[PDB]
Every structure is written in structure tokens, then in C-alpha cells.
């Protein structure tokens, strides 16, 4: 099953008392096949309460998605600063080469992020430059003679004041309090699909979401209730990177052997990733409340074609005389069978 | 000769009494060189009268070109349906992941298509998903427990009504009759070039052809009469995939050894493909009436520079004192020689 | 040091009494890493006074930058001609597949160009087609029977008048005199940065520079005075191809081993090229007056973040309580240290 990236394919870049940063394997490492996803990666970020992710710049456009917790993200330009209050379901673009830091101002609740990483330098090449003091503070890379001229300060002072502590450090109540375009929330609009059985929330390329147009990207939240099914469908255009945010379930992804059809099975678990390539029929069942985050690559004009249920059911659209010829049953047996599923998009499993 | 793809490089995907579908080799298989054409393929489609190409979706934008015959193409969205009457010289975009079917409603005449295939999933990766009942009907890939919940019908009935016949099947007079943006025809406008000897019809990127802008594509029809020559020229920007639709002839494509100049020769025949990379001078002669279809990749601002004849002759544009220095003859000998070819674009061979 | 392409990595395509044309190695040859620069090359052009670069077309968009001298560039369309007066600091797009020739009309001063080459046919594949008479005049590639029909002239005359001299030939005072959108000069606007120590001139993607938007490109001129330093900075988005036009100096480019930080050192000399990938901190010192030309790939919204000096200093933008936590010193020691460098962008070394 090449479409399944289990949670352990997340390489820990950094772990301590206060949080962890994990990067998912290059999609195009294990097999070719995702040569079109070669310039995307996922990062999981988790931080304990009253913590700060210290000044760093990454050589990638990032789309942040907050799964849990509350953050102040501060983004620096050369001559300017902007900070954004981040909530559950908030997404924002953290552009390439922006020095930024990330406060978890909540008192009890962990901050959990997933980032879509779009590198700028080499397809999928994740590069991070640490301004603050680590083993890897980049300012230390400059020779003494460059620093001394650069800062017009004696090296010894540059060393004592700027140069010589982990990457996510505790911040105190006084520092939090003293710290004091916009995020688009997946849920501050009516869900696209909503049902006793599930809901799908989606922000897609439209004027209104100019950044999603430019990156040609959708961010979906899919909820499947215990014992429900996301009814079979394919995306017309989009390649969906599905991260399992919470819950367990199972997934039937139909592709080819890679003209024969192969069903590709995956147990689903927190932190697991599945690629659903465009046009690949997929069915999803939750054994507990399942919360999926989807990044839809090549999103413009994407279109969920369901193969059962009343809405968004492309089979319904087949003219009757062609229905007669495409399936073994009569028009009346086919139209009746298709009416037996009263639900749309989601349903009992 | 790496630029010549003979008709036999078409792999038959499907053949029966009623029609055939053929896919051309990956351009970038035999040699690197066409690394820029790696995400295009050609498909030849032929179907007997009163036939239907049953519901299928392909994971590629397709540009259909009708060479012969007449079709009703029906295109399905999740909640909508559209059918288009297709004629000789009609082109239309059949977008990725659209379930569609294709009727040949003519009584006597075969329907002949060429498709440009722009895959969505892997460069040049042709993927087709069969909704109707074949060996490869994709609905069969789902486990019993998913289908039964999905359709809310007992598996046995799903099997009898939907699941369990070729890919192009006969349709009857009653079914045809009962079956009852837009296509852009290459010829419903004045041909770009027209002459006793040949004609070139062309739709190019302009506002008016928004789809050709977006795909950055031209579709040309080139006719060369028995005993005529398409006068030497190069395209400034475009990479031309030339399919021989009917007739025989010969082609001199000048490139490099791959600073030396190599003449690349090809006998030309129905179903043969030649790549003319940008800036590569080309001359074409018909031994019978030659009908070429050209797909022009990277089309925006393309520009046919002829090297002989009165119009579109870049040599004419050389200022005289530079003419003196660029060619061995005098200004008067050069301007006179260039006047000896009264014809433009096409001429006697 | 993979980022340093010494002047000798320029392959001479053509040399004689009258000038030379040189092409830089494929960036992506020696190492992967510049897989994003794979479709750019640099060409150095030098020509003696009263010389013409004879009719040729290249299968690449070219951005010409005049470092020295004065030229008349004549650009041919099929039905039209345009010539541009070119001066020190003038840049112009010479589009793919345009037959063009280049006069040095100055009497004493050599014409010196650098071209950015964006090939159209194969990533980085430099292809040149010589219309005028060389070993490699492309018109000679056509068989006798094609030329005779093509020009409607006996081959012997085609041979004597058009076919059968170097690539850059002397032109006479009478021919120069007789020879008789627009160029954008780097300096016909206030320099972006200007100082006792250096200046940076820059044309970037904005409406006004539609061609730089379309190619997504900046052209910079950077001057560093003897004994001055270009203060440490990174570009947020842009990948900078830096050509040393005149002078000597030294460069500290900080990257990774390819999480550790490596300082990448280079002596700098006329004709040397350094790639500064996005987000890679860089410091530059001149030992003589240093004149750099930079082509900035992926330029849109690029942003020079300085790490010292008063303007464009991203460290300044860190809120004080986070300054406390990111560097070992106190707020007061850090803000004071950052004030010690009064200069901006450039400074004494």
C-alpha cells in the first residue's frame, strides 16, 4: 500500500519537556508515483502551555492548521511585525524566509499544529535557520571579522549578548501578559456537507481566498462519527493529503496495480497520512469519531463525485438509456437501487 | 531520428468489432530531450456507427479533436450533465475526473478522434477508471461490507443491478433517437494561411479562447496538397506535436546532434507523430493530400518565421547592410533571390 | 563549496579577434541542490568596437544586461523589425526564437553583456541556430530539392547568394552610420540602498515591469566599495545568481551540510558566479570596488532581511520580552548592541 504513510514515518526534528517538531518522509522517497507531491511535506508541531517556539525562518511557504490549543504567531518583516491570534481550525500562510515565533498562551491546553511545507530551494528540501541560541544558531557561522564589522561591537560582546537553551522554551505569566492576511477558520462558515453521520468543512480556491488560489490549495476538515461511512467518491482534480487528526477507522482507496483495479486498504490512526490521487475512488469508515485534515493539491475546480446517496452522485446524472447499457440491471432496478441510500456524503457503515 | 514516433508506437488499449482506443508511447521514454513533453500523451479513438463509449473518467485534462464522423459527447458533474454535438474539426476540453460517454450517432461514418492527454497525478501517467461493467469496473474494488452500507442494498442485488460486455458497445436507432464551454471548430474562421498549395487553420491562446490560454496550447490543422511544400519555417516558442491524420509525405526537421546541424528525415504516414521543438526549422512535402493535426505546447506568442516566400519571411526583415554581411551575395542578388518565391507559407515542391 | 562557480566554469562557445561568447556550466551538473535553477544558464558576450553578432535565433528567453559599451540590438519578427539602443545598466528581454543581431557602434569601447538564458525545449538545453554563413548555417541542412523549391531558385544560385566567415564580424563606419518593450536601465531610478560604503540598484516584479512579473525575476546591481561590507542578510523568497562584473572580494554564505550550519567561503573575482539560495544568510566584502550583477529567480515579494544596522534589520522587529528569551543578553544589552551599527545595508569591513 504505497498511499499509506503511518505516523512513524514522522521523523522527530526536536523533542523536549515543552514540545516536539516532526517532519513526514518525502512522499516521493519510497516510490515514484507521488512525483507530483515531491515539493510538499507535513510538519506536526506540539507545545506544552506557556511555551514559545523561538525565532526561526524556514525556506518554505507554510500553511498552519491549528488542531487544538490557542497560539500567538508573530511574523517579522525587515521593518515590520504582525502577530495573529490562532484558534482550533484556524489556517494561515507563514510565508518562506519570514523570521517568526509561536507562543502557546493557554494555561492548561497543548497547542497542536499541522503545517503544509512548500519549499523554495529544492523540491521537498526542508531547511530551517535558527536565529535564537541553539547548537545551530546561524549567526555563529560568520567569521569573527565579519561579526565585529557587521555589529560594530567587539566579538566578545557579540558572543555574550547574541551567541552564547532548547528550541521551544517555557515563557512566564508575566511575559505572556506583557506580549500584548488574517487567519481563515475552517468552521466560521456553514459546513459543505453535514449529516447525522459526518460533516466536511472546506476552504477552496475562490476570489475571497486569494492565497488558496495562488497556492492552488484547499484545506478540508472531515468528521466521521463512530459507525458512519464517508460514502464512496473521487475528487475530479485534487490530490488529497489526508492527516488523521483524531480517532481510528479504515479506508478503501481504489487505484490500479502500481488496467486492473486494486483496493488499497489502511487501518487509520492519529498521525497517519494517506494520499488520495485525483480520480481515485475512496471510502472511509470510523470505528471511533474520526477527524481528518485534508490538504488538496491542484484544488481549482476540484469536484467530489459520489457513487451512492442522493446528492453529488454522478451515477444519477447518467441518462436512463445509457444507464441501461452501462449496468446489467434495467433502468427501473438501477434508479430504485440508487434511491435505497437516502443519505448524502455520509451514512451508517 | 528521435522526433519521429511511427504509428506502431501507438499501444492498443482496447479493440473490438465496434472501435479501438490507442495510447502513444511516453515521449520521454526512448530519449530524454522531450523532458518538457513528459506530461502529454496522444490517444487515437475510432468507433463504428451507432456505438457508445461507456461511462469512464480519465485522470487527465483531454483536448478532443474530431478528424471524421459526428458524436454526442455527454459530460457529467456530480449534480449536472451537459452533452455537446461534435463535428469534423471540433475541439473541446474534457476535464480530468469527469465521468463521460461518447455516442457515434452517424449511421454509416466512423467517428475518429485524437485526444491530447494532460495527466493530473504523475507526469504522463495515463489512468482510466471504468464505471460501466468491464473486467475493470472500479465499483467491484470495494469490499462487500462497504458496497452494502454505501448503496443500502443487499450485496446480491448490487451484484445483479450494478456489477455483473466491452468498453464500446452497439447502441440502437431507438436509443440514439431517445438520447435527445462549447466546441470550437478549427475551420469556422478564415484559415490563417490559404493558397493553391496548402492551408493552415489554427486556434491559439487569446482572450476568446480562455481554455487554450490556461493550457497554453494551440490546435492547428495543416493541409498540404499533392506536390506542394510547406515552405521552410520555425515556431518561435511552440513545441508542435504533429499527428498525420491522412495522406503521405516527407519532412526535413533541422536540429543539432542530439553546435553542428543535423537534418532529421521522416517518411510521413497516417497515425505517425513528429515533435518539432521550438526554433527547429522544418520543411514538409505531400506525395498525396496531407492533413496534419498539430498540438502546440507553450503556444503563447508563438510565431511562424518562414525562411522563403513573401509573407512571414524573417530573412526579408534583415536590414540590407546586415544582409550584405550575413550572406555571401550582394544586397541586390539576395533581395532578388528572395523575390523568386512569389508564394507564401506553401508552394509547389 | 557547491555555491561557487569560478569564471573557468564558463565554456567558450566562440572566440576570435572581434569578441567571444561563453556559456556557464549547467548549475545542476556538479550537484543536485540547484534542481530549481536547472532551466537557467548565463552567457557572457564581449565584442570589440565596430562589430556585429550576425543573425542567429536562440531557443531561450534571454535577459540581456549591458555591463559596458553601447549596442544596437535588432530583433526580427516574421513581418517586422525593431532595434533598441543599449547602454551600461540596460536590460531587455530577447524572446525565444527571435532572429536578432547585435552591433557594437562605439569606436573605442568593448561591449560586455551577461544574458540570463531560459530555454524553451529541455531544462537548461542551450540551442542556437545560425542564419548567417558559419560551419553551422542551418539553411544548409535542407536537401537540394527542398531549397530549390523553397526559394524557387537553382541550387547553384542559393549556394552562391545565401550559403557559401566568423559569428562576430567587423562592420565599417559607413555600415554603422547607414544603420539608422523598451530597455529598463538598473540606474534610471533612485538606488534602493545607497551609502558611503555601497549601493544596491534593483528592478523587481511590479506592474510597471510586466516582463519581470511574467518571468518572476529581479535584476540587481550591487556596488561594494574597497574596504566595505554588505551587511549580513538573507532574501526571503529569491534565489540570487550573483555574477562578479568587476573587482575582488570575499563572501560568507551560511547554509547547512549539503540541521548544523556550514559557512561557505569564496574568494570573488571577475566572471565568478555564486548561487545564494533563498533564506541563506550572506555577507560580502570588497578588497577592490566590487560590482555584482544579481539575477533573482522566484523574485515576487522577495525581502532582504538584514541581521545588523538600523534599516531592514529583522532582529530589531523581535518584541523585547522575546529578545530576552532568544539571546543570552538582557533586553538593554541587546538593543544597545544592535544600535552600535549606525550604518544600513553596507558598512566598513
Automatic annotation (TrEMBL), chains A, B, C:
Source species of the chain: Pisum sativum
The protein's name: Convicilin
Key words, A-Z: Signal, Vacuole
Record's subcellular location: Vacuole, Aleurone grain
Chief location category: other
Family to which this protein belongs: Belongs to the 7S seed storage protein family.
Shown residues in whole-protein numbering: 201 to 589 of 613
Chain segments annotated as transmembrane: none
Domain Cupin type-1: 2-159, 184-335
Isomerase in keyword set: no
Function (record text): Seed storage protein.
Gene Ontology CC annotations of this record: aleurone grain
Amino acid at each position: 500500500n504505497p498511499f499509506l504513510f503511518k505516523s512513524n514515518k514522522f521523523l522527530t526534528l526536536f523533542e523536549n519537556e515543552n514540545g516536539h517538531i516532526r517532519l513526514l518522509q518525502r512522499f516521493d522517497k519510497r516510490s515514484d508515483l507521488f512525483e507530483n507531491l515531491q515539493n510538499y511535506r507535513l510538519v506536526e508541531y506540539r507545545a506544552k502551555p506557556h511555551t514559545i517556539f523561538l525565532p526561526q525562518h524556514i525556506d518554505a511557504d507554510l500553511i498552519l492548521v491549528v488542531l487544538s490549543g490557542k497560539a500567538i504567531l508573530t511574523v517579522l518583516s525587515p521593518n515590520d511585525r504582525n502577530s495573529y491570534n490562532l484558534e482550533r481550525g484556524d489556517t494561515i500562510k507563514l510565508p518562506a524566509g519570514t523570521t517568526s515565533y509561536l507562543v502557546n498562551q493557554d494555561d492548561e491546553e497543548d497547542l497542536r499544529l499541522v503545517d503544509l511545507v512548500i519549499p523554495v530551494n529544492g523540491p521537498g528540501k526542508f531547511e530551517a535557520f535558527d536565529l535564537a541560541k541553539n547548537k545551530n544558531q546561524y549567526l555563529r557561522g560568520f567569521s569573527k571579522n565579519i561579526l565585529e564589522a557587521s555589529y560594530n561591537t567587539r566579538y566578545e560582546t557579540i558572543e555574550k549578548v547574541l551567541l552564547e537553551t532548547d528550541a521551544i522554551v517555557k515563557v512566564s505569566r508575566e511575559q505572556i501578559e506583557e506580549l500584548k492576511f488574517e487567519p481563515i477558520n475552517l468552521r466560521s462558515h456553514k459546513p459543505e456537507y453535514s449529516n447525522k453521520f459526518g460533516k466536511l468543512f472546506e476552504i477552496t480556491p475562490e476570489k475571497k481566498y486569494p492565497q488558496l488560489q495562488d497556492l492552488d490549495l484547499f484545506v478540508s476538515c472531515v468528521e466521521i462519527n463512530e459507525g458512519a461511512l464517508m460514502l464512496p467518491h473521487y475528487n475530479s482534480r485534487a490530490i488529497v493529503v489526508l492527516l488523521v487528526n483524531e480517532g481510528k477507522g479504515n479506508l478503501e482507496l481504489l487505484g490500479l496495480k502500481n488496467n486492473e483495479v486494486q483496493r488499497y486498504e489502511a487501518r487509520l490512526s492519529p498521525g497517519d497520512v494517506v494520499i488520495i490521487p485525483a480520480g481515485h475512488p475512496v471510502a472511509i469508515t470510523a470505528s471511533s469519531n474520526l477527524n481528518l485534515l485534508g490538504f488538496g493539491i491542484n484544488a481549482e475546480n476540484n469536484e467530489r463525485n459520489f457513487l451512492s446517496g442522493s446528492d453529488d452522485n454522478v451515477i444519477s446524472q447518467i441518462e436512463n438509456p445509457v444507464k441501461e447499457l452501462t449496468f446489467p440491471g434495467s433502468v427501473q432496478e438501477i434508479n430504485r437501487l440508487i434511491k435505497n441510500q437516502k443519505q448524502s456524503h455520509f451514512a451508517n457503515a
